[PDB]
Structure formats: C-alpha cells, structure tokens
Design a protein around this ligand. Structure first.
Ligand code: TB
Ligand code: TB
Ligand code: TB
Ligand code: TB
Ligand code: TB
Ligand code: TB
Ligand code: TB
Ligand code: TB
Lengths: 135, 141, 129, 141, 139
C-alpha cells in the first residue's frame, strides 16, 4: 500500500542546509507536503506537558501539487525552503536553506490538491529529526 | 509621551470570539503603524514533558499589523481568515477581532507601535518603538 | 453611489498586484474568469458559456470584519481606508488560475453576488504562465 | 427557429447615447450566445475618392457578445468602456447601451444568435445561426 | 526624433512580413505601429468627402520603452508581435498569417523619452514616420 520513507535529516549548524527526501510507494486533486512538530506547547503554563496539550497538531511547512504546478509555504520558511517533486521516481524533496534553531523539529512527509491542514492528510511518514545548532 | 493601553482580553471556549483593543495616545510618529504580537506558552523542545532550559527565554511572535490609515494590513498565516486587524484612525485605536479561537491562541497579547511597519515585510519585535503591557487571552479546549 | 476600480493588469506568475476600489454594510471583491475551452474543441459552448461571479474577499464598512474564499485566503488580503472611503485587495504569489475580471461590490460579511447592491465595472487581472 | 427583432436605432450627435434592443423568440437560444454585429461604411482602399468594385463589401464585424446562461460579456476593443451588452432573462431581450458615441460608430447594427462562440479569437459573421434585420445608427460629427 | 520605416511590401495572404523602425535615438519613450487601411464612406453616398477624410490612423501594436509591456489591436493578437532592441536603435513588427484586411500604410510612432508606457492612441504620439505600404493579396 501507501508507504512514505523520509530521509535526509540530521544535525546541522545554524545557517546551513539540508535536503529532505520522501519516497512514496504506490498512490499519490492530490499532492504531498512536509509537516513538522517543534514540540508540544504548555497551554496552561504550569511547567508540564499534560492532557489537551499532547494534541498540538503537526504544523504545515510546505506542500506541492501532484502535477508539481502548485506550491505553498509556511510564511516563516518562505524563501528559505523549496519544495519539489520528481514524478518518475517515487520522491518529493524539501531543500532547506538558511536553517535556524527555530527550525528544529520532527519533520513528517504527508500524502493525500495542495494539502495544507493536518486533518486533510491521509497518509503519514514516521518522521525524521532535524536539529539545528542554537548558534 | 506615547502610551498604548490594551483591553478586551478574555476566557472563552474553543470556537468563540474576542476583540482586543489598543488605544494610542501622545505623539504617534505618523509613518508605519501598529501591530499585535503574542507570547504563547513555550515548546517542550527535547520532548521530556517538562518546560525548562533553553525552552524558557521568550520571544514575541507577530500576529497582525496595520498602517495608520488602515489601508494596509498583514497577518501571520496561522491566524489569517480568523483574525481581522482594523483601525479607527479617529480614536487612534486599533482592534483585533478574533474569531474561531483555538487553544493554541492562548497567550499574552501585546499591542505595539512601529514606525518601520510595512505590509508584505515581516515585522520584527526588536524594531518596535512602543509596547503595551499585554492582555491575557485564554481559549479552553 | 459609484465604485471605481484601479490597479489591475498583467503580472508574471508569482508576482503581486494591489487593487483599489473607491466609493462615493460592507464591500467585497468578486472575480469572473473568461471563457475556458474545456473540451478544447476550438469553440465555447454549453456549460463553458456559464461563468460564475465568485466571491473572493469581503470587509465590513469599519474594516473590523473580513472573510475570504478558502482558495485565496493565503494569498489575498483585503483592507479598508475610511476617510478616503477606499478598499484595497493585496494579491501576492499570483497564479494563472487567478486570471479573471475582478469586480468591487458594495452592499447595505457580504459573501454572495445576489446580496450585492452596487457593482463596479471590473478590472482585468492577467497572470503569465 | 429563432426570431430576432431589433429596436432602438436613431440619429444622435457625437458624444450622445443610444440603447439598442433585440427581442428573441424561438428555440434553444438561451443555451447559447447572443451578439451585436455592425456593418460600418465601405472602405476606399485604393484612395481614388469613391467606392467601387471589391470595396462594396458589407463586412459585418463583431461588436459585443454575451452568454445567455451566465451573462459573461466580450467586446470589440474600440467600443470597450463605451458600450455595454446585457440581457434580461424574464423579458427575453438583449440590450446594447451605447455611450460616448462617435461618427465612426455609424453603421447598421444586427442582433445575432449563435450556439457557440469561437475560442481565443473573434466570432465571425459566418458563425451566426440567426440574424435580425438590422438597425441604423447614425452619429453626427 | 526622426523615424524611418522599412520592411513593407506585397505578400500573398497567409504570408509574413517584418516591419522595422529606426529612430535617431530609441531617447524615444513608448513606441507603436499604426495603420491607415483607407477612409470610410461613413454617410454611404459612395463618395469620400468632408469629415470622412479625417479618419484617424488605427492602432496596431505598441511597446514600452523597456519592452516589458506590449498591447495589440485585438484583430491582430496572436498574429503580430512587436519587439524593441534599444541597443541597436530598432523597433520591429513581425506580421504572420496576413489577411487582405491587413493591407494599409503602416506608420511607426514614438512618444517622448519619459512617456515610457505603451502608446495606444494617435493623440499621444509625439513623432511619426512617413509610412510604409503593406498590400496583401486575395488569390
Ligand atoms: Tb501544562
Ligand atoms: Tb522540556
Ligand atoms: Tb531546554
Ligand atoms: Tb506562520
Ligand atoms: Tb468547447
Ligand atoms: Tb475606391
Ligand atoms: Tb479592434
Ligand atoms: Tb461619403
């Protein structure tokens, strides 16, 4: 069935780049996207992550058409990240330049047009860690 | 002296609405405009269920901004279409209508006056000229 | 009670435009595509002759409330300048799908063409792709 | 089996206005388009000062067109902004509002029904299924 | 500025021509091609007389100082292409799929250097060429 295999994460100095890759087994209006989880938010300011706070949805980073003709970017990564697709091989790519400590997160490839909201995603990869130095 | 006084904070359930107000007085500097920033709760970076360490020093995130006339507005994309920023230039007062509130919107909201604001360019907290003292918004899940 | 548009024209795909409507309740921008030869037979016929006047963005008279069609919410921003009694539409990262005639409208948030009370003449917006 | 009856012709001075009407009766015309064509004067293409020979051609050129179902409009560019085509689905009538008339707008104007418009280019007289009898518009200089 | 046209001629319908315009400088701002296919017998008496002899030259195509903006008469769109080589001091009109109705005297036109927009109206022309004949066959 549908399998999404992420590669290309790691540790990188602030200002550096990475290229994430997601190869999609057998499936896909439609498109793919990259989401990221920078961590749960303490929506109570008590010092702990508990209850309703573990439901912080993964945040949209970039998405792309099945055709590749449509793209959308989270506004804090526009101009620094470029999403692209090679339908021919199984793969979608996120070029990430000018990386910031704020970009540290678990990045997740997503497949369903230009998918943007987590609920609107059907299939998820298991995620890959990106940890940028705090410079 | 220029001063910004905020109001309209509230506690509502998810899906509700609020409207924050910021009243500007004194010698507003005419160019640029005003904006709302917010300090939400902090992120469990290393995923240990706690908040500590590098997860403690805080940074205010831009939410919306508006020119003094009101003709140019700009939004953080996670609030676009839910929040509306407006100005009553007469009363030198700026408003943030907040619809379809979400738990993640819980934060201290700070009004700001910034001579360097312009739509389409990110508005930096470090470039703000005057700050309000903040009002609490809490959205229950 | 007139409404006069300004600021349309041709633009590269990915570029930006700012539209203006000056008046003389709330206001809104609608858009209507030109004929599309769907079945690509060289003619315009049947359902291809029907073009919806679609809602894009709307704003209350005070500017305190806005609404957007979901496909344009990320790229269009609507705003109001009272005193000059003028409404703006900032349009960024435009795509060829955005090619259409854009109509400013006013009504005594306005969301549907049947609720419009006054219409501008329209301004052509063309995105190159 | 479309019958088209035109009205509204006249004689006005440059700068004036008229409104042509075309009343439509018959079958399927609401599933297609309607248009106004005009036959301006002959062109003295060899510059001898009169009209003769091949110059006696009544070229009927598209001026304005409309989809009956949705009301989309298209105009010859020399009349855009001055002319407005519209239709009233209750009265089965099409209109051509002509403002800021000019001597060059003098012509016989013909209402036309067509099932299809050409895509990307102007619809031609030979593409019309049914025609009205023609209505004279004369604009003085 | 002085404008001089070239590239006119006599061509079978369906053929092509390229008109060229050389100016003293572009120094010229926006530029355009106009054409006069002939006076129209507006009062239908068979003569040409009176105001009928005043008929303005018709806009065909126009181009910005920089060449980044163009406009066309709708009956030539997709057939004609206007271009500008400010280095070589030349403005061109490629004319494909020519029709008999395209027969006319074609005139190069220019506005002053700082009206850099697209020229679309005769009243907005500052300087005119003397014109070049184009004649397209039927059979
Ligand atoms: Tb907590
Ligand atoms: Tb922690
Ligand atoms: Tb820490
Ligand atoms: Tb954002
Ligand atoms: Tb078709
Ligand atoms: Tb003759
Ligand atoms: Tb024309
Ligand atoms: Tb005569």
């Amino acid at each position: 069935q549908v399998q999404l295999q992420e590669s290309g994460g790691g540790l990188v100095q602030a200002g550096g780049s990475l290229r994430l890759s997601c190869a999609a087994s057998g499936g896909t209006s439609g498109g793919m996207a990259w989401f990221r989880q920078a961590g749960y938010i303490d929506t109570n300011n008590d010092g702990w992550i508990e209850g309703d706070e573990l439901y912080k949805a993964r945040e949209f980073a970039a998405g792309i058409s099945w055709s590749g003709g449509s793209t959308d970017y989270e506004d804090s990564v526009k101009g620094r990240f470029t999403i692209s697709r090679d339908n021919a091989k199984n793969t979608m790519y996120l070029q990430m330049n000018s990386l910031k400590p704020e970009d540290t997160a678990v990045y997740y490839c997503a497949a369903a047009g230009v998918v943007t909201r987590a609920d609107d995603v059907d299939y998820w990869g298991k995620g890959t860690q990106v940890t940028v130095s705090s410079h």
